[PDB]
Design an enzyme around this catalytic site. Structure first.
Site, PDB file in Angstrom:
ATOM      1  N   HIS A   1      17.158   7.663   0.408  1.00 44.82           N
ATOM      2  CA  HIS A   1      17.364   8.791   1.318  1.00 44.82           C
ATOM      3  C   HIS A   1      18.702   9.488   1.089  1.00 44.82           C
ATOM      4  O   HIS A   1      19.386   9.882   2.032  1.00 44.82           O
ATOM      5  CB  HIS A   1      17.219   8.349   2.773  1.00 44.82           C
TER       6      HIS A   1
ATOM      7  N   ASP B   1      11.222   8.191  -1.106  1.00 43.17           N
ATOM      8  CA  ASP B   1      12.198   8.594  -0.095  1.00 43.17           C
ATOM      9  C   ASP B   1      13.618   8.559  -0.671  1.00 43.17           C
ATOM     10  O   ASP B   1      14.475   7.778  -0.262  1.00 43.17           O
ATOM     11  CB  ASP B   1      12.066   7.714   1.152  1.00 43.17           C
TER      12      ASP B   1
ATOM     13  N   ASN C   1       7.031   9.691   1.445  1.00 46.76           N
ATOM     14  CA  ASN C   1       6.508  10.743   2.302  1.00 46.76           C
ATOM     15  C   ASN C   1       7.461  11.919   2.391  1.00 46.76           C
ATOM     16  O   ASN C   1       7.041  13.016   2.768  1.00 46.76           O
ATOM     17  CB  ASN C   1       6.215  10.209   3.698  1.00 46.76           C
ATOM     18  N   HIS C   2       8.731  11.716   2.057  1.00 50.21           N
ATOM     19  CA  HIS C   2       9.707  12.791   2.070  1.00 50.21           C
ATOM     20  C   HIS C   2       9.699  13.594   0.783  1.00 50.21           C
ATOM     21  O   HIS C   2      10.427  14.583   0.687  1.00 50.21           O
ATOM     22  CB  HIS C   2      11.103  12.222   2.312  1.00 50.21           C
TER      23      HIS C   2
ATOM     24  N   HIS D   1       9.517   2.657   3.912  1.00 47.39           N
ATOM     25  CA  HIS D   1       9.083   3.670   4.888  1.00 47.39           C
ATOM     26  C   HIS D   1       9.486   3.311   6.314  1.00 47.39           C
ATOM     27  O   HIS D   1       9.327   4.137   7.211  1.00 47.39           O
ATOM     28  CB  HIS D   1       7.558   3.918   4.819  1.00 47.39           C
TER      29      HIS D   1
HETATM   30 MN   LIG Z   1       9.355   7.094   4.352  1.00 48.90          MN
HETATM   31 MN   LIG Z   2      11.873   6.911   5.126  1.00 46.03          MN
END
Ligand SMILES: [Mn+2]
Ligand SMILES: [Mn+2]
Lengths: 281, 104, 580, 278, 301, 290
Positions: free
Chosen positions: F54, F80, F112-113, F236
């Site tokens: 992230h 991510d 998912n990002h 996640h």
């Molecule tokens: Mn995620």
């Molecule tokens: Mn995440």
């Protein structure tokens, strides 16, 4: 000697943090390493002739009794071929919930993805299934009863060509071969007209989205007309069932031939000489 | 007082003659492999023996807990990322002056 | 007609996408260059001034553009025409736009010549400070430092008067801005004028009702003290510092604490001895943890800067008991802040004072629960080593640091590794083998890669110190055992160890002990080990004897350069080129 | 499940416990719909006699209400027991609750039963997402639902599911179900008999006059006659005058929409009233 | 570099086009200029009204036409770079500046009578219409339809419906365009296209344009006509006779020109495929004497 | 070509971004490399599995200091890489550069990002604008995100993945059959693989997020048995201790972003799998920032 060997592996390379040794790993995932699972393949020639023995036996079983038109051949019984078709469906796709011979909207292929993938995987693993399919297609009305297997294999191939990222189709040799064999079988089974039954000749020269469009045209045609055995008229002259597409009112598949002609025109640089295979008469 | 379901399911296989029963696995019998040598599989015997030996002797100025990777790091998923509750157990810092993705 | 660049082609770009507006503003130089400079001043700049927009990013870009608009407006001579639009930007509610506008204003200040500064800029400053809205008043504070040095004396006295009025304003954030800019503004003034005008208002600022203004006052206290002559600080700055250090708000006392060392430097040592050390004392003994931590980090810098004649007396009489109470502080941040500087007192106090007083404090902090304390203590071990020698280190601190070689946090173990060469270089082979050699080997199998890397690099220094016979007897066998390990991390660790060991072990040891082990790893199933073997053979090539290159190293590299993994191929062929 | 384990979240169980028990439900038993419905109603009527909300023998007070709705989510599969299959819904009578004989039905005045019958097929239904009303289900739970004053919902699409859930959310009201009946001749129709609900609005609902009992009290009866859970209220379609005096305490209860309300609002006589009897 | 800089400095266009690496690309410059002029005029009431005929729109259109003229009116690049509505409006504006009134049918007036630049403009428009119909007949690997992002949903949806409207309009006039192209093959006079200088003169017979061979124009028109007939040939096989004639005329013109290809850029592999397809579909009496591959031999037999 | 890539990696390790043309060429190479990868990538046994990064670049440097430098350590990243961090651009650029340079040593999956909507909302788009002035770098990266494999398969036993399982997916052949070249949809088989979470429940459930499902222990048991898996490795979800075992060791969540939003104060772990699938989790704390 798993524990004996494990005790050997516990010999400390270094004396340890404080004279006391702890094992490096927190555990083992599963039962350790998986076995390699080495594959084995026999001679292809012996496979060919084993298939020949089996198929000759099945032809003898399916053929009607029996110089009687010396250059001709006996008629294969559509009842014996229907028996072969239903047992094929039961062996491959026993869970036949959507077992209507009428084909559904091609959007329904997105609902039965697991079933279609199972059918495709069984066709991949067992090359004998295609041989049995063309055996069924030799008797015209029998391939109507294999409609679920044809639909599932076509849906699997359509998904593959939709997901394909190559620009050429030969990078997927089995899927190209399967699409060609599928269109050839449903043409030989008189589930497709000659024009739409010849597109498999140009599949090898096409991009994945083009062959996907052609197979979607096949699906649309089968939605319009349907592989229904009632459409087959018994001809007592030769004792065989006949599908005459001209009486069907759209048997040429003109809306479904427009896509094929556009695909030819777009790739005319390579598909020019193939235009004769898709003439109107 | 009875809605709590404070009872244990009959984890047994009533053995027929042609009393004794065969037990079944339960949720509450979390393996205290450090505290009980019967919970250690044969295939994991040597490395886990090393682990409990280290946990016992190397506890000098350390911590004498149960089995790591089980009693801890097998937390319920609801409490897995409860950082609001987790930060309370840590000392506070010094002051200076599509719906959700696990935070603001 | 729709071809005038000024109104048309600009007010049509008010679309929803802000990025197009920034692009238009980014390329405002091109439209201006297209227009005549007189036409630009007549039509473009009044349009910018009169119109008001409502997007922070466009306004920020516009303010940034106007700082470099002097060439496209008619040169420095006509640069005063940029003052209205930036004035409009200086009155906006958003603070960032105001700061950028003030930056642009003081950037174009240099473009003005003294006469234009007096004619246009100073009236602008007066308007901003005299504005109805406080935003303009705060904006006016940052403009004083650039207009002041290059104006007439009457204008300078006026500027002093308006800054004094701005400081004494009823509005809080205006006072905050004035206090923030007081340090910069007082830098350029005349010293007598500083005493007459700045100092009374500064003392008034330190005694204000709000606490943020007092915080900024103490911020500016360092610069104000630095400006003044030393003979004046007892009556001017020191009462203000005494007031501030005892303030009720802990923020003011905190920011006094961070600024304490600079105050000490500014006011001169005798004033610090007389007046600062009780202030430092009750800052360290203060109730709040933030101010205690802030004062703790300043202990070394404060004590080092005192007069040596009266230094140690101050330290033991005032500083040291407060340190003793801080070592056992409840808050871990205070202890960590103290730990990062406490070893610096060792050369100052001397050897015997360090042993009798500082060493128990080090030992207490070396056994703290908080990892930050332990990490900050070890990092400055060289100082105490040089002070007390190594006999006292082995007696007192060695058992404590050996316990920290197995710390939970790996940065502590990294510090211990980083401090092993020193100890090795100051200890004999026998003692090091008895105590610390196993510690050096224990780190090679650490989980953290940084620990293994540091230990590998440490082996080079250890062999440099204790010779290669010691390495052959104690180092090499425990390294070679790691080559047979089922974990590929440990095999790669031996390849790294061989990389650093070939340089110092000499031709013979590298040739006969290390090379056969390196070559047999070419058949490894892990590609990582294989291409690291290629890398190692590249690296230990120079320090090998030249006879075994073509016979032994070359066939293995030839086998590796046709391997199935592309990385193994690449590193094998790179090794093949380097071998020549 | 069985009564010891049938109740997962009852009285004095907080929301987190409810969520945890809902998440971990497993479908591993028989379709003991009648027994589970009996246990549910017993749970609802657990504290009625302690707090005297029923007001037995002292008139039926619409403001003495603890409004509850049972939303039973099920399928149309036939009811089962260990012995065999039950073709019809029958609530057991064994192990009667103390005082259960005082009301001749398990459900109560302020309780309604709603059934969410899931008929979702395993195949993607070719029917379009028609905006029509939700059908009544034809399972064995529908008569019990209708008797209680609720209704059953047949669901065979997620869109239908949403529609039923929205209608159910709209049906969470504080009120008591009245069995409205027609007395006398017309002024075999939907508005002749209806189990409609009358709304009770709090602020602690305030009211004075009870609904009459179905018997004349006497001081020599050893036992109290059993009560119908829904009082049989009879109206005469005569259009009398709604006489009211100024200072009297009169309780006003708004009827929910129903064919009887449709009939009354369609005849369009707001200045006249139908007298009501027990 | 941005679009407005070309409006502020009029001669910047020529300077930018002589750059070896013009950033943005000339086609991107055309896209920007025509998109700017395509914005509907919005009053102070925030109401959509058609864009105004101001000096800004006129000079934007003239800049786009100048950039197009720089590329020698190469329809291939404009087709693979500019969208159908953009190129449609560009060609319509080209007709407008070349003194072709909106609403007049291109099949009515004789092409030889008009000036060479105006005739070539009408010819290029009809060629583009033919090629657009042919290309729209082809299949394209459609982009995957993601979730709706309204900001871009609106723009490509209005683009797509504009494209569909233009396509049905062209199909309605497809016969007219075919007749216009057929008439243009009869011309034997030198032809001139619109250059920088001619457009500049038009800002405020004739040989002021760039000379273009009659052979090259005949070759390109025959090629496009053959493609159009081949597209029509699927529905009516008799139309393939015309396509064979057009493609063999194209082959002869290619042979005549030799290797002096300047404006006539035709793919030889695609032309060869077209010739093979026409030979198979319409077997000529002389094709039997020509060497037949076993494939064609089996088909004929 | 390889030397320039090594220079970029050396530069990116110091948290200095590349130029737009460099990012364009890098994403071109990465596209041509990620075309060949299947939806279920096959990874050999010695590998280190990492969860969400992230955009916490310095935490990624701490991760490399813990587990080792690429290419010496094989890494599997489970999506991510962007949003909720200050250095999303540098993080994703370094990971893509490592993938291009060391094809067989780096596996980068899709989180998912890695989608246009989530990047637009949660700060990768804003970061790209701030660090480059135009959205072209964001365009290149989001087009590249469509190319990322959905899942990996270590040894044929461990099924690495970002989100979780889907009611519509029963086999790995279904995952291999999906067309991953698209923006992640709001509903469907591909969404659940990136959006689902395990739960202490029975069967399937509605995710508290707006997408995916939430699945109980029986779901993962049936999935593992039907697909011959021993473990479903996962990301996640924030884990306070960095890793957490779920569903009787059928599922393990791994979070590699310590002090996740610079406020959560969580640890971060990475699953180091050795040659014989003997795992070990390396918990690590956030790096000391200057
Ligand atoms: Mn995620
Ligand atoms: Mn995440």
């Amino acid at each position: 000697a798993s524990l004996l060997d494990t005790n050997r592996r516990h010999t400390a390379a270094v004396p340890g943090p404080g004279g006391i040794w702890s094992v490096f790993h927190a555990g083992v995932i599963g039962r350790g390493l998986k076995p390699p699972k080495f594959v084995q393949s026999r001679n292809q020639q012996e496979v060919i002739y084993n298939t020949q023995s089996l198929l000759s036996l099945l032809v003898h079983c399916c053929s009607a009794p029996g110089c009687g038109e010396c250059w001709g051949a006996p008629i294969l019984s559509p009842e014996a071929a229907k028996a072969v078709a239903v047992t094929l469906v039961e062996s491959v796709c026993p869970d036949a919930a959507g077992a209507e011979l009428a084909w559904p909207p091609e959007e329904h292929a997105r609902a039965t993805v697991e079933r279609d993938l199972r059918i495709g995987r069984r066709f991949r693993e067992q090359p004998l299934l295609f041989e049995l399919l063309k055996l069924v297609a030799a008797a015209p009305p029998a391939l109507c009863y294999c409609s679920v297997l044809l639909r599932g294999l076509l849906a699997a191939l359509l998904g593959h060509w939709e997901a394909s990222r190559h620009p050429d189709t030969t990078h997927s040799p089995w899927h190209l071969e399967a699409s060609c064999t599928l269109v050839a079988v449903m043409a030989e089974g008189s589930l497709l007209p000659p024009a739409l039954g010849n597109m498999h000749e140009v599949f090898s020269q096409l991009a994945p989205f083009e062959v996907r469009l052609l197979l979607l045209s096949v699906w649309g045609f089968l939605r319009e007309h349907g592989p229904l055995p009632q459409k087959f008229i018994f001809q007592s002259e030769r004792g065989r069932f006949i599908r005459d597409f001209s009486r069907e009112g759209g048997g040429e598949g003109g809306p479904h031939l427009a896509v094929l002609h556009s695909v030819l025109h777009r790739n005319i640089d390579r598909l020019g000489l193939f235009s004769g295979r898709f003439q109107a008469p | 007082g009875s809605v709590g379901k404070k009872v244990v399911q009959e984890t047994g296989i009533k053995v027929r003659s042609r009393g004794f029963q065969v037990a079944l696995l339960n949720k509450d019998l979390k393996p205290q492999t450090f505290r009980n040598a019967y919970d250690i599989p044969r295939r994991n015997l040597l490395d886990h023996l090393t682990r409990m030996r280290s946990n016992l002797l190397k506890s000098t100025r350390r911590f004498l807990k149960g089995q790591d990777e089980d009693q801890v790091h097998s937390v319920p998923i609801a409490q897995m990322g409860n950082y609001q509750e987790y930060l309370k157990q840590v000392p506070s810092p010094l002051r200076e002056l599509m719906m959700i993705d696990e935070a603001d | 007609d729709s071809l005038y660049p000024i109104a048309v082609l600009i007010d049509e770009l008010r679309n929803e996408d802000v990025q197009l507006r920034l692009n238009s503003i980014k390329k405002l130089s091109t439209i201006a260059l297209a227009l005549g400079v007189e036409r630009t001043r007549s039509e473009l700049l009044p349009f910018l001034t009169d119109t008001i927009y409502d997007e922070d990013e466009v306004l920020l870009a516009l303010a940034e553009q106007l700082g470099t608009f002097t060439t496209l407006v008619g040169g420095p001579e006509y640069v005063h025409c940029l003052l209205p639009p930036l004035e409009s930007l200086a009155t906006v509610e958003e603070t960032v736009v105001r700061d950028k506008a003030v930056e642009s204003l003081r950037a174009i200040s240099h473009e003005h010549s003294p006469s234009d500064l007096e004619a246009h800029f100073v009236p602008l400053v007066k308007r901003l400070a005299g504005g109805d809205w406080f935003t303009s008043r705060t904006s006016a504070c940052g403009l004083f430092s650039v207009c002041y040095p290059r104006v007439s004396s009457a204008v300078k006295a006026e500027l002093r008067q308006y800054f004094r009025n701005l400081c004494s304003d009823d509005t809080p954030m205006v006072r905050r801005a004035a206090a923030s800019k007081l340090g910069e503004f007082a830098k350029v003034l005349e010293l007598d004028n500083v005493k007459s005008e700045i100092i009374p208002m500064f003392s008034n600022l330190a005694s204000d009702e709000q606490d943020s203004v007092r915080l900024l006052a103490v911020e500016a206290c360092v610069n104000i003290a630095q400006l003044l002559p030393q003979e004046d600080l007892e009556a001017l700055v020191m009462p203000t510092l005494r007031q501030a250090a005892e303030d009720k708000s802990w923020r003011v006392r905190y920011m006094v604490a961070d600024k304490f060392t600079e105050l000490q430097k500014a006011v001169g040592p005798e004033i610090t001895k007389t007046d600062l050390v009780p202030a430092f004392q009750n800052l360290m003994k203060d109730c709040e943890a933030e101010v205690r931590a802030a004062a703790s980090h300043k202990v070394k810098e404060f004590c080092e800067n005192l007069s040596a004649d009266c230094r140690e007396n101050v330290i033991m009489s005032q500083i040291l008991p407060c340190i003793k109470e801080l070592v056992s502080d409840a808050n871990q941040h205070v202890k960590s802040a103290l730990a990062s500087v406490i070893m610096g007192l060792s050369p100052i106090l001397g050897k015997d004072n360090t042993i009798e007083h500082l060493l128990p404090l080090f030992l207490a902090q070396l056994k703290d629960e908080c990892p930050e304390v332990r990490l900050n203590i070890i990092s400055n071990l060289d100082c105490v080593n040089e002070v007390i020698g190594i006999r006292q280190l082995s007696q007192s601190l060695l058992p404590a640091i050996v316990e920290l070689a197995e710390d939970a946090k790996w940065r502590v173990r990294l510090a211990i590794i980083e401090y092993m060469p020193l100890l090795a270089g100051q200890l004999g082979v026998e003692f090091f083998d008895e105590k610390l050699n196993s510690l050096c080997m224990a780190w090679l199998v650490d989980h953290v890669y940084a620990i293994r890397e540091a230990a590998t690099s440490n082996l080079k220094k250890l062999v440099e110190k204790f010779g290669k016979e010691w390495a052959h007897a104690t180092i090499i066998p425990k390294v070679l055992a790691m080559s047979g390990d089922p974990n590929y991390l440990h095999r790669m660790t031996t390849l790294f160890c061989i990389n650093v060991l070939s340089e110092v072990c000499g031709q013979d040891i590298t040739t006969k002990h290390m090379l056969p082990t390196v070559l047999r790893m070419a058949g490894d199933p892990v590609a990582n080990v294989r291409f690291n073997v290629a890398k190692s053979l590249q690296k230990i090539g120079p320090i090998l004897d030249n006879s075994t290159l073509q016979s032994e190293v070359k066939p293995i590299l030839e086998k590796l350069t046709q391997d199935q993994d592309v990385d193994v191929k690449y590193f094998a062929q790179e090794a093949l080129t380097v071998l020549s | 499940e069985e009564p010891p384990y049938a109740i997962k979240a009852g009285w004095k169980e907080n929301h987190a416990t409810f969520m945890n028990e809902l998440k971990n439900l497993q479908a591993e038993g028989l379709t003991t719909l009648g027994q589970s419905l009996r246990t549910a109603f017993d749970l609802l009527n657990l504290n009625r006699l302690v707090t005297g909300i029923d007001n037995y023998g002292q008139g039926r007070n619409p403001f003495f209400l603890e409004p509850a709705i049972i939303i039973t989510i099920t399928d149309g599969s036939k009811l089962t027991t260990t012995s065999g299959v039950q073709d019809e819904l029958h609530l057991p009578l064994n192990s009667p609750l103390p005082g259960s004989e005082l009301t001749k039905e398990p459900f109560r005045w302020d309780q309604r039963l709603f059934a969410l019958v899931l008929r979702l097929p395993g195949t993607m239904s070719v029917e379009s997402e028609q905006l029509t009303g939700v059908p009544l289900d034809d399972s064995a739970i529908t008569p019990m639902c209708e008797v209680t004053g609720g209704r059953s919902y047949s669901v065979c699409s997620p869109r239908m599911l949403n529609q039923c859930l929205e209608s159910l959310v709209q049906k969470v009201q504080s009120g008591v179900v009245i069995n409205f009946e027609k007395a006398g001749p017309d002024p075999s129709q939907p508005w002749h008999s209806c189990h409609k609900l009358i709304y009770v609005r709090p602020n602690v609902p305030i009211g004075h006059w009870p609904v009459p009992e179905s018997f004349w009290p006497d001081q020599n009866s050893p036992t109290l006659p059993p009560r119908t859970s829904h009082p049989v209220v009879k109206f005469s379609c005569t259009d009398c005058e709604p006489m009211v005096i100024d200072k009297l305490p009169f309780d006003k209860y708004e009827l929910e929409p129903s064919p009887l309300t449709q009939f009354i609002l369609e005849r369009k006589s707001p200045q006249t009233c139908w007298q009501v009897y027990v | 570099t941005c679009w407005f800089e070309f409006l502020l400095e009029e001669s910047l266009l020529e300077k930018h086009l002589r750059k070896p690496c013009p950033d943005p690309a000339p086609v991107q410059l055309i896209v920007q200029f025509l998109e700017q002029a395509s914005k509907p005029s919005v009053n102070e009431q925030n109401q959509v009204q058609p864009p105004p005929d101001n000096k800004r729109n006129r000079i934007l259109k003239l800049l786009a036409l100048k950039v197009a003229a720089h590329l020698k009116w190469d329809l291939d690049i404009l087709e693979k770079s500019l969208s159908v509505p953009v190129l449609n409006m560009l060609l319509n504006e080209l007709l407008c500046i070349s003194k072709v009134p909106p609403g007049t049918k291109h099949v009515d007036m004789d092409l030889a009578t008009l000036p060479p630049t105006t005739a070539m403009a009408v010819l290029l428009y009809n060629r583009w219409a033919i090629r657009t119909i042919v290309q729209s007949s082809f299949p394209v690997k459609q982009a995957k339809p993601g979730p709706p992002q309204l900001s871009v949903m609106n723009q490509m949806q209005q683009e797509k419906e504009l494209t569909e409207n233009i396509l049905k309009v062209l199909k309605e006039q497809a016969a007219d365009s075919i007749l216009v192209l057929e008439a243009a093959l009869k011309l034997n006079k030198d032809l001139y296209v619109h250059t920088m200088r001619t457009l500049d003169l038009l800002a405020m017979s004739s040989t002021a344009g760039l000379k273009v061979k009659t052979e090259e124009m005949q070759c390109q028109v025959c090629y496009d006509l053959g493609a159009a007939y081949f597209q029509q040939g699927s529905t009516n096989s008799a139309v393939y006779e015309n396509a064979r004639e057009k493609f063999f005329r194209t082959k002869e013109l290619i042979a005549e020109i030799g290797s002096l290809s300047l404006h006539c850029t035709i793919d030889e592999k695609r032309l060869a495929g077209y010739c093979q397809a026409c030979d198979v579909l319409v077997p000529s009496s002389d094709s039997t004497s020509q060497q037949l591959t076993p494939y064609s031999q089996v088909h004929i037999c | 070509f390889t030397k320039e890539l090594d220079q970029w990696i050396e530069q990116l390790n110091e948290c200095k971004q590349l130029s737009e043309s460099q990012v364009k060429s890098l994403c071109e190479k990465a596209k041509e490399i990620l075309t060949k990868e299947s939806n279920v990538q096959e990874v050999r046994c010695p590998v280190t599995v990492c969860g969400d990064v992230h955009g916490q670049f310095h935490d990624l440097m701490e991760l490399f200091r813990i587990g080792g430098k690429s290419p010496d350590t094989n890494y599997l990243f489970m999506g991510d890489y962007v949003n909720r961090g200050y250095y999303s651009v540098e993080t994703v650029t370094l990971l893509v550069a490592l993938k291009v340079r060391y094809r067989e040593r780096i596996t980068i999956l899709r989180g998912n990002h890695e989608s246009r909507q989530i990047t637009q909302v949660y700060g990768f788009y804003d970061e790209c604008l701030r660090k480059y002035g135009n959205a072209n770098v964001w365009k290149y990266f989001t087009d590249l995100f469509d190319y990322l494999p959905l899942t990996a398969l270590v040894d044929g036993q461990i099924f690495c993945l970002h989100g979780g399982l889907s009611p519509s997916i029963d086999t790995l052949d279904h995952i291999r059959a999906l067309d991953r070249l698209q923006e992640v949809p709001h509903e469907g088989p591909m969404c659940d693989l990136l959006w689902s979470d395990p739960d202490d429940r029975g069967g399937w459930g509605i995710s508290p997020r707006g997408a995916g499902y939430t699945f109980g222990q029986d779901i993962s048991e049936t999935f593992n048995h039907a697909n011959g898996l021993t473990l479903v490795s996962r990301a996640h979800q924030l884990v306070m201790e960095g890793y957490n075992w779920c569903h009787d060791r059928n599922v393990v969540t791994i979070f590699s972003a310590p002090n996740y939003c610079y406020r959560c104060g969580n640890q971060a772990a990475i699953m180091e799998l050795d040659d014989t699938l003997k795992y070990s989790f390396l918990q690590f704390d956030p790096a000391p920032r200057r």
